[PDB]
Each structure stands twice: as structure tokens, then as C-alpha cells.
Design a protein around this ligand. Structure first.
Ligand SMILES: [Mg+2]
Ligand SMILES: [Mg+2]
Ligand SMILES: [Mg+2]
Ligand SMILES: [Mg+2]
Ligand SMILES: [Mg+2]
Ligand SMILES: [Mg+2]
Ligand SMILES: [Mg+2]
Ligand SMILES: [Mg+2]
Ligand SMILES: [Mg+2]
Ligand SMILES: [Mg+2]
Ligand SMILES: [Mg+2]
Ligand SMILES: [Mg+2]
Ligand SMILES: [Mg+2]
Ligand SMILES: [Mg+2]
Ligand SMILES: [Mg+2]
Ligand SMILES: [Mg+2]
Ligand SMILES: [Mg+2]
Ligand SMILES: [Mg+2]
Ligand SMILES: [Mg+2]
Ligand SMILES: [Mg+2]
Ligand SMILES: [Mg+2]
Ligand SMILES: [Mg+2]
Ligand SMILES: [Mg+2]
Ligand SMILES: [Mg+2]
Ligand SMILES: [Mg+2]
Ligand SMILES: [Mg+2]
Ligand SMILES: [Mg+2]
Ligand SMILES: [Mg+2]
Ligand SMILES: [Mg+2]
Ligand SMILES: [Mg+2]
Ligand SMILES: [Mg+2]
Ligand SMILES: [Mg+2]
Ligand SMILES: [Mg+2]
Ligand SMILES: [Mg+2]
Ligand SMILES: [Mg+2]
Ligand SMILES: [Mg+2]
Ligand SMILES: [Mg+2]
Ligand SMILES: [Mg+2]
Ligand SMILES: [Mg+2]
Ligand SMILES: [Mg+2]
Ligand SMILES: [Mg+2]
Ligand SMILES: [Mg+2]
Ligand SMILES: [Mg+2]
Ligand SMILES: [Mg+2]
Ligand SMILES: [Mg+2]
Ligand SMILES: [Mg+2]
Ligand SMILES: [Mg+2]
Ligand SMILES: [Mg+2]
Ligand SMILES: [Mg+2]
Ligand SMILES: [Mg+2]
Ligand SMILES: [Mg+2]
Ligand SMILES: [Mg+2]
Ligand SMILES: [Mg+2]
Ligand SMILES: [Mg+2]
Ligand SMILES: [Mg+2]
Ligand SMILES: [Mg+2]
Ligand SMILES: [Mg+2]
Ligand SMILES: [Mg+2]
Ligand SMILES: [Mg+2]
Ligand SMILES: [Mg+2]
Ligand SMILES: [Mg+2]
Ligand SMILES: [Mg+2]
Ligand SMILES: [Mg+2]
Lengths: 207, 124, 144, 62
RNA sequence: CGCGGCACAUCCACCUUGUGGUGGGUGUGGGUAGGGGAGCGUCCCUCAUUCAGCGAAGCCACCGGGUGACCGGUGGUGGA
RNA sequence: AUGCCGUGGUGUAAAGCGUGGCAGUGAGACGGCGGGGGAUAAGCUCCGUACGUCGAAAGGGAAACAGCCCAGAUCGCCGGC
RNA sequence: UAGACGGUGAGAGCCCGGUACGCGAAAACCCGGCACCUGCCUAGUAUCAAUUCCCGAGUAGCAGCGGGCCCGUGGAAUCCGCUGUGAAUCCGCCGGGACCACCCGGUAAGCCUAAAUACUCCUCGAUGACCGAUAGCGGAUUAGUACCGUGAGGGAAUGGUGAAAAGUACCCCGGGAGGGGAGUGAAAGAGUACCUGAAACCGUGUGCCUACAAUCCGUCAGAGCCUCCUUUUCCUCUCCGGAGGAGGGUGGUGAUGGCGUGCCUUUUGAAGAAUGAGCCUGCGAGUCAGGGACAUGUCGCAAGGUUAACCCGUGUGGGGUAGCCGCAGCGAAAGCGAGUCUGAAUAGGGCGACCCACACGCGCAUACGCGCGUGUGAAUAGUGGCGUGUUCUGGACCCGAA
């Protein structure tokens, strides 16, 4: 409930109070399972096609007369039991995008961030690098002072470009704006590191 | 996601052909003609586990009948006299005393002759 | 904490599909059809009874016309004015929309089922007959 | 696409307030001299669709 | 009928006295069209964990295991 | 005589009825009994039967032998009736 | 600010081409600015009078036959074609669903007009819970080639040594082909017939059975041999070991006895002398689209639930109230509304609404009740998503005509 800000190469300067109606929602796994599934459905590109027996090139005529040969009657050279012929009930290009209600999406993000904050996994900082030119060597050593884990979600504002560029190629660090938080990326990450400009711009969008 | 069928399909082909060793002709070389015989071979086996309990009894009765007629009694009046005396030996062991111990079979025929009634044709 | 491998759906929300025509241990060769007739290869329409004159041509048509110029009225009972507005006051067409008793952008009509004990001052289109009796009995008024 | 409904069943059936389905009765449009008033009053008004036709009639209205 | 294993339904006691398990009775389990219930095997993706040029896949043989679809072990062949 | 309809007892778990979801079937076969058509012919034909078996039922019997007689296979046993 | 992707003798940010990021254009083309250049304007405006003139002609309108609109000639307006007749210039003409009167609206028969919208032969740059050589384009390979047809047209099959050719010097049998010994290599159990190398099918060797027997080819009973492991006791050379024999147990074979009419489809009924199948390998049939329809499992919110287009974001996220379903029914409708239609009816019906499980209080009472409060605080409920079973429209489970 009481999260304190840590400065790069320093100590605690302030504190941020987390609201109970935004960071202490109970966990609902079946609600979170539908939301996370509906997100990864929307990431599928769905570009996969085949050809049915009318799209396959040629194959229009009847290959021989029906009666009198001792062959089976066939009707087309691209009927689907032929080698090289059409495909029956094949994949066509689809769109996987579920229309999940707004109150179900927003009550899984609050339930995942509550589970992080209930276990002491929300960290507030003020900036990643102390200056204006980026440096990955200084950003890596500062995140190791906070967390010693493999998955970290660094949530910073969009105008902060020096802190963004300082953690782009670290293995296991994902960057997203505060108004782009979603349930899949918060449940993937073992730790969430908010910027204080980012956490105050998330509480103020939910009162 | 296209799935080739070979890794799944070859698991029932091997256990049919491994269970069809010893069969002659196409019934041990080809999968389609060996699945048919395994339908017949496992039906006959079910048929014969239940039928071999009355083939051995058919063999046990035929040997007791032979060992009773050397001690001049029939199989008919031997089962009657053993039940009338209260001897509950099954026909498996009564047709194994008939071979492995012929002198104790006679001591049972002499008990099935004493408990048998005085006139076996008289009404009871 | 919660991870992506602790998220399973609720019990009963997801039952497996019925794949058909996949061997004799399930719905087997005919796939639940069994026939040799029409139902084994096609559908039969709902509008067809085999040749006799169907149920949608035996019976006569329902009588009448439909008024092209019919004016409808959304409806609130006077026993819902009591529960929603227990102290009374000015009850307009806009305050019944926001309290969730009538729809948006529609002509309203106040009917009279319930018990009105509050002293309301209700403004609406086209009051009822038993509704004006219960509003003025509580000391109110009823204007168009 | 969108599910069309049957134009003949919508003109011969309708729904009440609790979901029953009603219809009018036959043998009343003409040839009315030899029918006594005990018969034209039995054939007057509306009745409920019988319980054996209620499944095909529901899936024509919808 | 006897003795032993499994399965379903019901009754009766116990425990989250019920989403169910424990124990004991008792009945029941041929099956086509057909309906309902619970599972095996193959491929792809996400997440977590763990093997692998000190030999993966695949294939072959042998010895084993499950109530069934089928599975595990050891070896040989082979090369990701 | 049976059969049928109502009622009061006694007996019987997997009977009945109302309302929803998904059906399949609508070519039947011989045998017992009562009949029609046929020449009181047919392994013929068409009806009745809280009649049976096959259909969809393996086993034992009738030499062999869907429909007759006995009896309805959950599995195992080199026990018994 | 680089852990994109690939190459490199096996999983490389730190070995190579690159990546992040940042520099770069003689000339040609394109976009834009500024000059040149080109064009237009540089006399009317305001008020008043109310007589006249003009406001798009073989057109509108009307009539015959047709087309098209929700509208199939219908009471059929508006719009379009041909035939005939054929006006009026504002006190005009046309529309407002036959038509007329009033009222409202607009000025037909002249022309031009950006944007939002549709598409990809081709050109750059990315991506795939798409394919991986019977797949994916017909086409990874001479591919619209070979081939077939007079022609229009139809139309294949064919990928993989190894990290590196180091692609086997030389000798031997042979005319060669092919092989053996050497030799290269990690491997020739990789030899230009080449990675892995299954199955049908074809040999060679070897254990048991078989030349007096009538066999849906098996199965239960079962002697004998052969093979490989092993408790007791003999040789104890014995740390030995098994050398042999009797026993016990795996694996192969099966003299002999009993029982036994193939699979599938379709059938009242098939081993059937009904149909289909030579064999093995690969491939070959209930799928998808929709805020569709009905019913259900489950989750969210709940007298409400939910957005569509679109908008802003690196994305799956945040906005968006138009709309839809629910909320009151009855009636042909006017209309009335916990009622309403029918009807002369305060008659009866139809459809709709309405908790007395509950003490109490009420004009209740031999008792249950009647009506209304107080609650003891009774049980209604919808809607959106995602699964499933059927269903609708599409080729709609797949194959097949004349
Ligand atoms: Mg075509
Ligand atoms: Mg054709
Ligand atoms: Mg193809
Ligand atoms: Mg949205
Ligand atoms: Mg043999
Ligand atoms: Mg027996
Ligand atoms: Mg089949
Ligand atoms: Mg049918
Ligand atoms: Mg038929
Ligand atoms: Mg068929
Ligand atoms: Mg007719
Ligand atoms: Mg009339
Ligand atoms: Mg009359
Ligand atoms: Mg059963
Ligand atoms: Mg049984
Ligand atoms: Mg079935
Ligand atoms: Mg090696
Ligand atoms: Mg090796
Ligand atoms: Mg694989
Ligand atoms: Mg195995
Ligand atoms: Mg291996
Ligand atoms: Mg039913
Ligand atoms: Mg018929
Ligand atoms: Mg018939
Ligand atoms: Mg009949
Ligand atoms: Mg007769
Ligand atoms: Mg007959
Ligand atoms: Mg049948
Ligand atoms: Mg039988
Ligand atoms: Mg029966
Ligand atoms: Mg029989
Ligand atoms: Mg027999
Ligand atoms: Mg790489
Ligand atoms: Mg470089
Ligand atoms: Mg027309
Ligand atoms: Mg008008
Ligand atoms: Mg004009
Ligand atoms: Mg104009
Ligand atoms: Mg134009
Ligand atoms: Mg334009
Ligand atoms: Mg484009
Ligand atoms: Mg491209
Ligand atoms: Mg190809
Ligand atoms: Mg291949
Ligand atoms: Mg030519
Ligand atoms: Mg050589
Ligand atoms: Mg060599
Ligand atoms: Mg070497
Ligand atoms: Mg090798
Ligand atoms: Mg070869
Ligand atoms: Mg090879
Ligand atoms: Mg011989
Ligand atoms: Mg014979
Ligand atoms: Mg034999
Ligand atoms: Mg026939
Ligand atoms: Mg045949
Ligand atoms: Mg034959
Ligand atoms: Mg035929
Ligand atoms: Mg044939
Ligand atoms: Mg074939
Ligand atoms: Mg619900
Ligand atoms: Mg109505
Ligand atoms: Mg009434």
C-alpha cells in the first residue's frame, strides 16, 4: 500500500500511496484466463490459405467417358482424392479477435497488478538513467539493485526517450506506455517497475 | 498446421504384425490380412477359455470312469456314493488319484459302495 | 505470484469438440445419419411437410392492418415514481431517463400501478386516468 | 449473412406477452350458409398453436 | 452357486456433512441405427522447468507395463 | 372365458406423466393362436394378438441348420449344481 | 542507442556480412519557396417607381406500349426509352405516393468541380500458432518446357555426398562394366547408382516340421526335438568351471486331439455362387463466415447490460450512446392502460397482471380466510463474451451423370 521511490545511484526520496480500489482487487483466474486468451487470439496474423477444387489450375473437363472403360468415374482431374488436386475443408484466412467486454478487460489488469502489489513486486523509481544520453551499462546495474529476476516490466512514459533506449536490448525487459498496460504482459513479468511519472499517470486515469 | 500421418499410424501396424508371427501366407506379412485373423484369433481364444473348463472335466470324468470299472463299479454309482458319504473331492483331484495313487482310489470306491443304498433301483 | 501457467479456465467452461466420422468407437461411419434417403446427403427445409399443404398455408392470415402512423409511449408506473423518488420533487422527462426507468428520446406516459405516498410534481406526456387520481391524492400535480 | 424470416408465418402467427404463439382458425372464409352458429362461434377468435407444431412454428418466426 | 479383480446406479453412515471423497449393504453391466459421459496418440504456439555431438529425431530388435486407444526401459543404427 | 374402463387394498428402485435439447425408424422375417383373399394350395398374400424369437443375441440342444426348444455372455479359474 | 536476421566445420551481442545510430549525391526526375513570365480588375453604388422585357423547346405535360424502383399493372406517384399530340417565362412551372383545394418546399430542359471510396501487372521494406518436394503456384529441376491434339485447348515427372572434392594415385581379375587390396575422411554402416534408408517384393545360410493325407489356415489341449539360462549331485583338474547326466525356466518349432462358414457394404436374411478390395507406402470426407436462429455449460456486470462505424496509441490497450435486447400489456385499429378486446351487460369468456411459507393490526373468527399496513426482510432478471449441440445462407461431409 506504501511504495517508495528509488533514485538511480541513491536512496529513497519519496513515496507513492497505491489506492486499494486499483491495486487490491481480488484475483479472478477464470476472468484472467479469458482475457489473456482473447489477447493472444488478436495477435494471430491468420494468413494461411489453401486451394479448393475450383481454384486449382485447369481440371475442367471430364477426363474420360463414364461408362465402358473399367476405370472408376472421375469427373475432374482436380477432385480432392487425386494427387495434386484440391483441398477439402482447408485453412482459409481468418481473423481471431474476441469481443471481450470492457469491464472484463479492465478487471483482469487490476487483478494482476493487485497480485503483484500484494507480494511486494511493484517498484517505483524516478528515472532509469541520471542524464539525457542513454547508457545500457548503467541501466542494467540499477535494475539489478531492485530485482534479481529474469522478467521485468518497465513501465515508463512515452516522452522519456533516454530511459526507453537504455533498456531496449536487455534480455527479459519489456517496455510499454502506462495507457497500454494489459493482463498478458503483467502476468508474464515477475516484477513491474513503474516510473513515478508513469504510476501517477495511471492512478489519475482511474481516480 | 499440416500433420503427416506416419508417426501416429505405424503404432497399430507393428503390434498387429508382432502378434501375428507364426501365421502362414499373407496372414503374417501384410497388415490388412493380419488384422482380420487377429479378429478371429482373439475371438476363438475367448471362446476356448470358457470351453476348456468342460474339456478338462470331460477328461477327468473319462479317467475316473476307467479307474472305477477296474474296481467293478460304474461312474454313475461312484458319484452317488461319494455324495452319500460326504466326500467333497472335486473331479480334478479324483482323476489324479486315479493315476498317481491307484491304491487310495480303491479305498474311496469302498466308501462309495458302503454309503450307497441297499437297493439302488428301489424308490426313495 | 501468479504466472501464465497458473491460469486455467473454470470447471465446465470448455468441453471438447465432437469430431465425427473417425472410427467405430465414436460416431462411426454414417456420422449420426444412418439413413439411405434425403437426410443422409442433404438437408430438408423447414417449410416443407412432404406434399400436403403446410402449416403456413393451411391457416388463414391474422386479421387487420398495421397503423403506419402509430405513436408509441414508453411507460413508467406511478409505483416506480415512489421507489425512485422517495422525497418527491420535480419529476421531469429528463430525470426519469437518468434514474433508469424510461428510455432516451421517447414520448413518456405515466400509468398508475402501485402505491404513491410521496408528494411529487410530475411533468410528462399523456397522463393516465388512474394516475392523475393517485398523484393529486398525495398533494401533487400533473402537467403535460 | 443475416437470418431471414418466413413471410408466410409472420402473417399467420404472433406472440402473446408470455411467449405463447397464436393463430386463427380455418373453415370460416366462405360457404357460411349451412354452417350453424354453433360452428362459426367455435371457429371464431384465436387459439394456441398445439404442442406438436410449436417447434416448426417457432423456427419459422425467428 | 463358489473364490478373486473392475465398472455403473441406489441406499446408508463419516469428512468443506456435499463442487465431493471414505466405508459398508444391495441391485445392475449382449447390443445394430441412435443418444449421453470420460479418455489415448500425432503436429503447431505461449509459459514454466528439464535433457541433448559424453549422440536429438526417425527407424529396428529384445525385455517389460496399463481396463482400452497405447506407454516405459535397455541395446543397435543414425546425425540435430 | 378372456380382454377393456373406474375404484379400495397389498406388492414392486431404475415404472408413469408434463415440458425442453439431439435423434434414428416409417422395405420387415418366420413360428404359436383367431380370420380374410387363394382350390380352406404355397418358404404365398393381407389384418388381429401387455404373444414369442430373429432383426440388434453369443452359448447348450435339433447331424449341419437367422426365426423351433433351453437360456440372455462385465472379467478371470485345470471347482461345484 | 547494437541480445534483428543469417553466414561461419555443432545453440555466437563480443570471428564475417550486418544491426542500433549517424553521415552521403556529378547528373536525371519529383515536391516546395522566391523572381521572371502570364492573367484579371481599375466605375459604379444606394434609394424609389411598378408599365413592359428575359429567366435554357419539339423540352415539360398528357396519351399508347415497355424498362426500373420494397412495389410482379396494382388505386401506382416520382425516375428512364421509343411513338403521337404538344405548352407557358413568375398572377410562371415542378414536387410533397391516384386525384382535387389550400398550405409548405424548390427553380427542370446548359457546363465544370478536390477530398473521404475501389483495386495490384509491377517496385521497395517487413510479418506468419502458413507449406517443406504426392505438400506449396501447373511450375524449387529444359515449365506453360517435354508430350498430346489439325486447331481452339489440355499439360506432366524430376531437390539433398561431405565441413572441405580431399571425386579412390598405384597394383590385381576383366574387352569393358563391376569389384578386391591399399589410400582420403570423424564416418565410405557417406563412392558423383551418393544424408536417414521403413514396408510390400526377391535371394543365401540355418534350427525344428513336412512325401496315407480332405487344412476360412487359426485357437484351446499337447508329446517330441533344438536353443539359451539355471536349484540338488558326479568328475571336484574347483579362483575354476557348468565337461556330461537327471531337474527347473525362457525362445523357436508343432506329431497329434477338440472347436471353428474371411473382412466390408447392403439387407427380412450373406461364408455366401450378391457388391468392393492383387499387395504395401504416401495422400483422400461435418469445415469455415456471421454482434445471424433456438437451446444449453461457464464468466463478467446487474434494473440495467452492451457498443457499431470511427478516433487516438509501437500491439492485443484507452475512448466512442447512434443503435440493439430488457423495462407492460391488450386491440384490426382509433385508442385505453394493471388492465384490455368482444358485447346492450357491474354477464361470460380470450389474452395479460397479481408471494398471504409469515405472527401482528382490520368491520375478520365455531376455525382456515377477506382487504391493507408493519416486516419475520419472502424470490423473481435480464444482458454481453467465450465453449458445445442442432439450425439458416453460401459448393456446406466427400465422390459420380446423361
Ligand atoms: Mg474451373
Ligand atoms: Mg462435371
Ligand atoms: Mg496443391
Ligand atoms: Mg475497444
Ligand atoms: Mg506355427
Ligand atoms: Mg460350465
Ligand atoms: Mg467401416
Ligand atoms: Mg433417415
Ligand atoms: Mg431404406
Ligand atoms: Mg452407405
Ligand atoms: Mg397434391
Ligand atoms: Mg371475409
Ligand atoms: Mg351465420
Ligand atoms: Mg453395454
Ligand atoms: Mg448380462
Ligand atoms: Mg452406435
Ligand atoms: Mg563425434
Ligand atoms: Mg554410436
Ligand atoms: Mg517432429
Ligand atoms: Mg515400444
Ligand atoms: Mg535411437
Ligand atoms: Mg424427449
Ligand atoms: Mg413410406
Ligand atoms: Mg410399410
Ligand atoms: Mg406386417
Ligand atoms: Mg393362421
Ligand atoms: Mg412371407
Ligand atoms: Mg436393418
Ligand atoms: Mg442363438
Ligand atoms: Mg429382446
Ligand atoms: Mg443355436
Ligand atoms: Mg452344433
Ligand atoms: Mg542468431
Ligand atoms: Mg561490423
Ligand atoms: Mg415495372
Ligand atoms: Mg400527398
Ligand atoms: Mg430554369
Ligand atoms: Mg441549374
Ligand atoms: Mg460531371
Ligand atoms: Mg473523387
Ligand atoms: Mg497499396
Ligand atoms: Mg515483396
Ligand atoms: Mg509439385
Ligand atoms: Mg522426403
Ligand atoms: Mg504439334
Ligand atoms: Mg578401386
Ligand atoms: Mg577398403
Ligand atoms: Mg583413415
Ligand atoms: Mg555416421
Ligand atoms: Mg538407390
Ligand atoms: Mg543411402
Ligand atoms: Mg508320414
Ligand atoms: Mg471331412
Ligand atoms: Mg488343430
Ligand atoms: Mg433381397
Ligand atoms: Mg464375394
Ligand atoms: Mg466365393
Ligand atoms: Mg446390386
Ligand atoms: Mg472384383
Ligand atoms: Mg485400394
Ligand atoms: Mg448470467
Ligand atoms: Mg401488439
Ligand atoms: Mg377479464
Amino acid at each position: 500500500l506504501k511504495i517508495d521511490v528509488k533514485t538511480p545511484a541513491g536512496k529513497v526520496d519519496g513515496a507513492i500511496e497505491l489506492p486499494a480500489e486499483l491495486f487490491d482487487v481480488p484475483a479472478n483466474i477464470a476472468l484472467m484466463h479469458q482475457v489473456v486468451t482473447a489477447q493472444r487470439a488478436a495477435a494471430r496474423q491468420g494468413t494461411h490459405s489453401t486451394k479448393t477444387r475450383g481454384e486449382v489450375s485447369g481440371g475442367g473437363r471430364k477426363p474420360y467417358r463414364q461408362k465402358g472403360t473399367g476405370r472408376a468415374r472421375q469427373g475432374s482431374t482436380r477432385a480432392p482424392q487425386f494427387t495434386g488436386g484440391g483441398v477439402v475443408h482447408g485453412p482459409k484466412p481468418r481473423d481471431y479477435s474476441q469481443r471481450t467486454p470492457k469491464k472484463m478487460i479492465a478487471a483482469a489488469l487490476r487483478g494482476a497488478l493487485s497480485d503483484r502489489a500484494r507480494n511486494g513486486r511493484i517498484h517505483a523509481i524516478t528515472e532509469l538513467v541520471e542524464g539525457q544520453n542513454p547508457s545500457t551499462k548503467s541501466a542494467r546495474a540499477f535494475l539489478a539493485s531492485l530485482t534479481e529476476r529474469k522478467q521485468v516490466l518497465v513501465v515508463i512514459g512515452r516522452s522519456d526517450e533516454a530511459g526507453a533506449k537504455s533498456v531496449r536490448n536487455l534480455p527479459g525487459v519489456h517496455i510499454l506506455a502506462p495507457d497500454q498496460l494489459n493482463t498478458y504482459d503483467v502476468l508474464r513479468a515477475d516484477d513491474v517497475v513503474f516510473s513515478v511519472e508513469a504510476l501517477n499517470a495511471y492512478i489519475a486515469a482511474n481516480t | 498446421a499440416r500433420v503427416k500421418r506416419a508417426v501416429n499410424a505405424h503404432k497399430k501396424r507393428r503390434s498387429i504384425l508382432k502378434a501375428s508371427r507364426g501365421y502362414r501366407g499373407q496372414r503374417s506379412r501384410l497388415y490388412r490380412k493380419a488384422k482380420e485373423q487377429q479378429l478371429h484369433s482373439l475371438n476363438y481364444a475367448y471362446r476356448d477359455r470358457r470351453a476348456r473348463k468342460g474339456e478338462f472335466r470331460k477328461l477327468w470324468i473319462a479317467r475316473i470312469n476307467a479307474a472305477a470299472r477296474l474296481n467293478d463299479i460304474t461312474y454313475n454309482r461312484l458319484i452317488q456314493g461319494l455324495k452319500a458319504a460326504g466326500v467333497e473331492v472335486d473331479r480334478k483331484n479324483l482323476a489324479d488319484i486315479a493315476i498317481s495313487d491307484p491304491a487310495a482310489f480303491t479305498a474311496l470306491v469302498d466308501v462309495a459302495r458302503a454309503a450307497l443304498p441297499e437297493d439302488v433301483n428301489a424308490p426313495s | 505470484t501468479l504466472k501464465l501457467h497458473d491460469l486455467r479456465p473454470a470447471r465446465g467452461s470448455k468441453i471438447a469438440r465432437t469430431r465425427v466420422g473417425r472410427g467405430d468407437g465414436s460416431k462411426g461411419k454414417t456420422a449420426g445419419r444412418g439413413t439411405k434417403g434425403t437426410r443422409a446427403r442433404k438437408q430438408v427445409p423447414v417449410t416443407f411437410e412432404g406434399g400436403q399443404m403446410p402449416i403456413h398455408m393451411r391457416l388463414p392470415k391474422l386479421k387487420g392492418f398495421r397503423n403506419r402512423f402509430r405513436t408509441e409511449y414508453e411507460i413508467v408506473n406511478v409505483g416506480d415514481i415512489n421507489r425512485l423518488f422517495p422525497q418527491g420533487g420535480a419529476v421531469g422527462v429528463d430525470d426519469l431517463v437518468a434514474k433508469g426507468a424510461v428510455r432516451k428520446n421517447a414520448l413518456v406516459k405515466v400509468l398508475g400501478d402501485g402505491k404513491l405516498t410521496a408528494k411529487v410534481d410530475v411533468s410528462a406526456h399523456k397522463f393516465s386516468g388512474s394516475a392523475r387520481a393517485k398523484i393529486t391524492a398525495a398533494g401533487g400535480s400533473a402537467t403535460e | 449473412p443475416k437470418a431471414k424470416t418466413h413471410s408466410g408465418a409472420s402473417k399467420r402467427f404472433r406472440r402473446t406477452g408470455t411467449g405463447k404463439i397464436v393463430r386463427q382458425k380455418a373453415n370460416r372464409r366462405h360457404l357460411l350458409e349451412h354452417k350453424p352458429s354453433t360452428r362459426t362461434r367455435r371457429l371464431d377468435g384465436r387459439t394456441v398453436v398445439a404442442a406438436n407444431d410449436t417447434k416448426r412454428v417457432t423456427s419459422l418466426l425467428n
